[PDB]
Amino acid sequence: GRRLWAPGVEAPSYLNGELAGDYGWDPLGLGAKPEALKWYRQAELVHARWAMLAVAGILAQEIVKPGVFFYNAGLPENLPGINFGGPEGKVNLGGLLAWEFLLFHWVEVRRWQDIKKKDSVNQDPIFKGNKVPNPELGYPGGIFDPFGFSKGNFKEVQTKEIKNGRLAMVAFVGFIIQAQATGQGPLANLGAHLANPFGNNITKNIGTCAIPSSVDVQGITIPLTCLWPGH
Amino acid sequence: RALWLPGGDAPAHLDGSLPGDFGFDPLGLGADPERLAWFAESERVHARWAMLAVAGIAVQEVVRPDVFWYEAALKSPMPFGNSPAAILGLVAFELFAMHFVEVRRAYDFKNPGSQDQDPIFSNNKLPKHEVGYPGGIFAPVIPGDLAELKLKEIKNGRLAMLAFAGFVMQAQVTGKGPLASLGDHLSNPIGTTIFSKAVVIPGQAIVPPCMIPSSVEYHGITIPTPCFLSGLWP
Amino acid sequence: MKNFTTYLSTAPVVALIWFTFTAGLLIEINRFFPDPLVFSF
Amino acid sequence: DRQVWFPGNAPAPHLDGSLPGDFGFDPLSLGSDPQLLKWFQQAELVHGRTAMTAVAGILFPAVATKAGVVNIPQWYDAGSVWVQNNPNFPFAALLFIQIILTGWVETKRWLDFKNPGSQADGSFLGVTDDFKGVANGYPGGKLFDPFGLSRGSEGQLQKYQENEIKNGRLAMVAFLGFIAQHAATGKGPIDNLADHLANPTAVTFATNGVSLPFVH
Numbered sequence: 007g008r009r010l011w012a013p014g015v016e017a018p019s020y021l022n023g024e025l026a027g028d029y030g031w032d033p034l035g036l037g038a039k040p041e042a043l044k045w046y047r048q049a050e051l052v053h054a055r056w057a058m059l060a061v062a063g064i065l066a067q068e069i070v071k072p073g074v075f076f077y078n079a080g081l082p083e084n085l086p087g088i089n090f091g092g093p094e095g096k097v098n099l100g101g102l103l104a105w106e107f108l109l110f111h112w113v114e115v116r117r118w119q120d121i122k123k124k125d126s127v128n129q130d131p132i133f134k135g136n137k138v139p140n141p142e143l144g145y146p147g148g149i150f151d152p153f154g155f156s157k158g159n160f161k162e163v164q165t166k167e168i169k170n171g172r173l174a175m176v177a178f179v180g181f182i183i184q185a186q187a188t189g190q191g192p193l194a195n196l197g198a199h200l201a202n203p204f205g206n207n208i209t210k211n212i213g214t215c216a217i218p219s220s221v222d223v224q225g226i227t228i229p230l231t232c233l234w235p236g237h
Numbered sequence: 238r239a240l241w242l243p244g245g246d247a248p249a250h251l252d253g254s255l256p257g258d259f260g261f262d263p264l265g266l267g268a269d270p271e272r273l274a275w276f277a278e279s280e281r282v283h284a285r286w287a288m289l290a291v292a293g294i295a296v297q298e299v300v301r302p303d304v305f306w307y308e309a310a311l312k313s314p315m316p317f318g319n320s321p322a323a324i325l326g327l328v329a330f331e332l333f334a335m336h337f338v339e340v341r342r343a344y345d346f347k348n349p350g351s352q353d354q355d356p357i358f359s360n361n362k363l364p365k366h367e368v369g370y371p372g373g374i375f376a377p378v379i380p381g382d383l384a385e386l387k388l389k390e391i392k393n394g395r396l397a398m399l400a401f402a403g404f405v406m407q408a409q410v411t412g413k414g415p416l417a418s419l420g421d422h423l424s425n426p427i428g429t430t431i432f433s434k435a436v437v438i439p440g441q442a443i444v445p446p447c448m449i450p451s452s453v454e455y456h457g458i459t460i461p462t463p464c465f466l467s468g469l470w471p
Numbered sequence: 472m473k474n475f476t477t478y479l480s481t482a483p484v485v486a487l488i489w490f491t492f493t494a495g496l497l498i499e500i501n502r503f504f505p506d507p508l509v510f511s512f
Numbered sequence: 513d514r515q516v517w518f519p520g521n522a523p524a525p526h527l528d529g530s531l532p533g534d535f536g537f538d539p540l541s542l543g544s545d546p547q548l549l550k551w552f553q554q555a556e557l558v559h560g561r562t563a564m565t566a567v568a569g570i571l572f573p574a575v576a577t578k579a580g581v582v583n584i585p586q587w588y589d590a591g592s593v594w595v596q597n598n599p600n601f602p603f604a605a606l607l608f609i610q611i612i613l614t615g616w617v618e619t620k621r622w623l624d625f626k627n628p629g630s631q632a633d634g635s636f637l638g639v640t641d642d643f644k645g646v647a648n649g650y651p652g653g654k655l656f657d658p659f660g661l662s663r664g665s666e667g668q669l670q671k672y673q674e675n676e677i678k679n680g681r682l683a684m685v686a687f688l689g690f691i692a693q694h695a696a697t698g699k700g701p702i703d704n705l706a707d708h709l710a711n712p713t714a715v716t717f718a719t720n721g722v723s724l725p726f727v728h
C-alpha cells in the first residue's frame with residue numbers, strides 16, 4: 007500500500023496494494039508466494055468476520071445478561087431455558103454439536119471448493135437457477151449481499167471491513183486474556199478500570215489465572231488452561 | 238457430469254461410461270481397468286445383496302417385532318427335519334446352490350456369452366447382453382430405458398449398502414432393531430445420536446457398551462459373537 | 472564404502488574377525504558345555 | 513534441487529533423488545555402492561514395513577485396552593502371557609514353524625534380489641506373473657498388490673512410495689520410542705500417552721526416574 011505500518015520501512019515487492027488494508031506488513035514473509043497469500047487472505051477474512059461476530063456477541067450478552075460470564079457460557083445451566091425435546095427438554099450437547107458439525111461441514115466444504123477453484127461452486131446445487139456472482143475470492147455476494155452495499159466503492163468498504171476485523175481480532179484476544187486474568191466480563195473490566203485505574207489494571211491481575219483447572223460438564227471433565235501460566 | 242464433489246475434477250480413469258459414475262475414486266482403486274470391471278461386478282452384487290437384506294430386515298422387523306434380526310438365526314423356523322442338526326443340511330443345500338449360480342455368474346464374467354445356454358434344455362438360450370446385466374428371462378419386463386434404470390439400481394444399492402452398515406452398527410450399539418432405533422431417535426433427537434452417548438476428548442473417553450453378548454450356545458457350539466472393533470469405538 | 476570394505480578385507484582385519492569368531496565359538500561352547508574331556512553324553 | 517535433511521548442505525553425491533524418500537541423508541556414505549544401495553533399500557523397506565505392522569499391532573490393542581473393552585496384555589508381556597495361556601503349544605514348535613515359513617518367503621525374496629524375475633518361472637505352484645516383481649523392494653502383481661494401486665498411474669505409485677517410506681521411518685522411530693519408554697517407565701505406550709495427557713507439566717522424561725538418575 008501507500009501508508010505503511012511504520013515510518014521509514016519499505017513494503018515487500020509482493021504487497022503493493024491489490025488487497026484492502028495493505029500496510030506492507032509481512033515481517034516473516036509468509037505471503038511471499040501468491041498461493042499462500044491467497045490462502046492467508048481467506049484465513050484473515052474468516053478470522054476477521056468471526057471475531058467481529060464474537061465481539062458483537064460478547065458485548066451484547068453483557069447488556070442482556072450481565073450476570074452470566076461469557077467464558078462460562080458453554081456450561082449447560084448457563085444456557086437459555088428452551089426445550090430441546092425428550093422427556094425433560096434438557097440440553098445434551100451431543101446433538102447440539104452434531105447440528106453445527108453437519109451444517110458447518112457442508113458450508114465450509116463449499117467455501118473450500120470455492121477457494122480451490124474460483125467460480126466452481128457458485129451455482130445452487132438443488133435449484134440451478136439460483137447463482138452467486140462471486141466478484142472476488144472471499145466476497146461471494148448475491149444472497150450474501152442482499153442490500154447491494156458493494157455496488158459503490160468496493161475497495162473502500164473492503165478496507166473498512168478488514169480494518170474493523172483486525173480491531174475485532176485484537177479485541178477478542180483482549181477479551182480472552184482479561185477474562186482469564188480477572189474472571190469477569192469485558193465491560194465489568196472496563197468499569198473496574200474506570201473505578202480504580204491505578205489500583206486495578208494489568209499489573210494487578212496478570213499473575214492470576216482465575217479460570218479453574220478443570221470443569222465437569224454433564225459427565226465428562228474438560229481440562230482447562232489459561233493462555234499463560236498464571237496461578 | 239454430476240460429480241460427488243461439484244467444482245472438483247474427476248480422475249482420468251473414470252470417464253463416465255459406467256452407471257453411477259460420479260468421479261468418486263480418491264484412493265485410485267479402479268485405476269486398473271480390469272480391476273475396475275471386477276469391482277463394478279462386485280459393486281453390483283454387493284448392492285443387490287444389500288438391497289435384499291435391508292428389505293428383509295425391515296419386513297421381518299415389521300412382521301415379527303419380537304424377534305431381533307441379529308438373533309434371528311437362533312429363533313429361525315425348521316421346516317425340514319426333526320433334529321437340531323438339520324441346519325447342516327440346509328447349509329449344504331445353500332452351498333451347492335450358491336456354488337452353481339456363482340460359478341455361472343463368474344464364468345459369464347470371465348467368458349462373456351459362454352454361460353448363455355440352458356444346460357438342460359438346449360432350446361432355451363439367454364439373448365446377447367452385457368456383462369453383469371443378464372436380462373432375458375431374468376428381466377421379463379423393463380419399465381423404462383436401461384441407462385436410467387441402471388442409475389436407479391446403483392443408487393438404491395449404494396443406499397442399501399450404507400443402510401445395512403447402519404443396521405449392523407445400530408444393532409451393536411443399541412441391541413435393538415432399525416425402526417425401534419428410529420423411533421427412539423424421533424422421541425429424543427438431542428440425546429440419542431452417536432454424538433450424544435459417545436465423546437472422546439484428550440482427558441477421557443466415554444464409550445457406549447455393546448448389548449450383544451460375546452457368545453451364544455447354539456446346541457453346544459459356542460458361536461462367538463464379537464462386537465465389531467468395539468475397542469476402537471468413540 | 473568400497474575402499475572401507477577393502478580395508479576390512481585386509482589380512483589382519485580378516486584374521487581378527489575370524490579369530491574372534493573362532494575364539495568366541497570355543498568360549499561359548501565351553502560355557503554351555505562346561506568341562507568337556509571325552510566324547511561322551 | 514530437492515529438499516534435503518540439512519538445509520544448506522548438499523545432498524550425498526551417490527543419492528540422486530530417484531529413490532523414494534531421498535533427502536540426501538548419508539553422512540557415513542554407507543550407500544555409495546549402487547548394489548549395496550539396492551540391498552540397503554530393501555533393508556529399509558523390510559524394516560519399515562515390519563515396524564509399521566508392529567506399531568499398529570502394539571497401538572490398536574493398547575488403545576482398546578486403555579478404553580477398558582478388552583484386557584490384551586502389553587507388548588512387553590504378551591509372549592509370557594501367551595506361553596502361560598497355551599501349555600499345549602510349546603515355544604520351540606512355534607519358533608520352528610515361524611522359522612520355516614519366514615525362511616521360505618525370505619529365501620524367495622533373497623533369490624529375487626540376486627536375479628530379478630527369477631521366481632516368475634512357475635516353479636511355486638504355477639505362479640508366473642505375480643512373482644516377477646515391479647522394482648527393487650516393490651514386488652507388486654496380483655498377489656502382493658491385489659487392489660492394483662501400483663498398476664494405475666506412475667505419479668500415484670510415486671506418491672504411495674513416498675507415503676510408505678515416510679510412514680515406515682516414522683514407525684521405526686516410534687518402535688525405538690516404545691523400547692525407550694518401557695525401559696524408563698515400566699508401562700505401555702498408550703499408558704504413557706494417557707499419563708502425559710492427564711498432567712503434561714509433571715509427566716515428562718525428566719520425571720520418570722531413569723532418564724535423569726539424579727534426585728533433582
Ligand code: CHL
Binds near residue numbers: 099103231
Ligand atoms: C470455536 C469457538 C469457541 C471458543 C473460542 C470457545 C471457548 C471456550 N469454551 Mg466453548 N468455545 C467455542 C465453541 C463451543 N464451545 C462449546 C461448549 C463448551 C462447554 C461445555 C465448555 C466450553 C468451555 C469454553 C472455554 C474453555 C475452553 C478450554 O479451555 O478447553 C480446553 C480445550 C481443549 C481441551 C481443546 C478444545 C478445542 C481445541 C482448540 C481443538 C479444537 C477441537 C477439534 C475439533 C479437534 C479435532 C478432533 C479430531 C482429532 C477428531 C472457552 C471460553 C468450557 C468452559 O470453560 O466453561 C466454563 C466448557 O466447560 N465450551 C460448544 C458446544 C455447542 C461450542 C461449539 O462450537
Ligand SMILES: CC(/C=C/C=C(C)/C=C/[C@@]12O[C@]1(C)C[C@@H](O)CC2(C)C)=C\C=C\C=C(C)\C=C\C=C(C)\C=C\[C@@]12O[C@]1(C)C[C@@H](O)CC2(C)C
Binds near residue numbers: 542570591
Ligand atoms: C530405528 C531403526 C533404524 C535406525 C537406523 C538409522 C536411523 C540409520 C541411519 C543412518 O544409516 C543412515 C540412514 C545413513 C548413514 O550414513 C548414517 C546413519 C545415521 C547410520 C529400525 C527399527 C526397526 C524396528 C522394527 C523392525 C520393528 C519390529 C518389531 C517387531 C516385529 C515387534 C513385534 C512385537 O511387538 C509385537 C508386534 C507385539 C508384541 O507383543 C510382541 C513383539 C514380537 C515384540
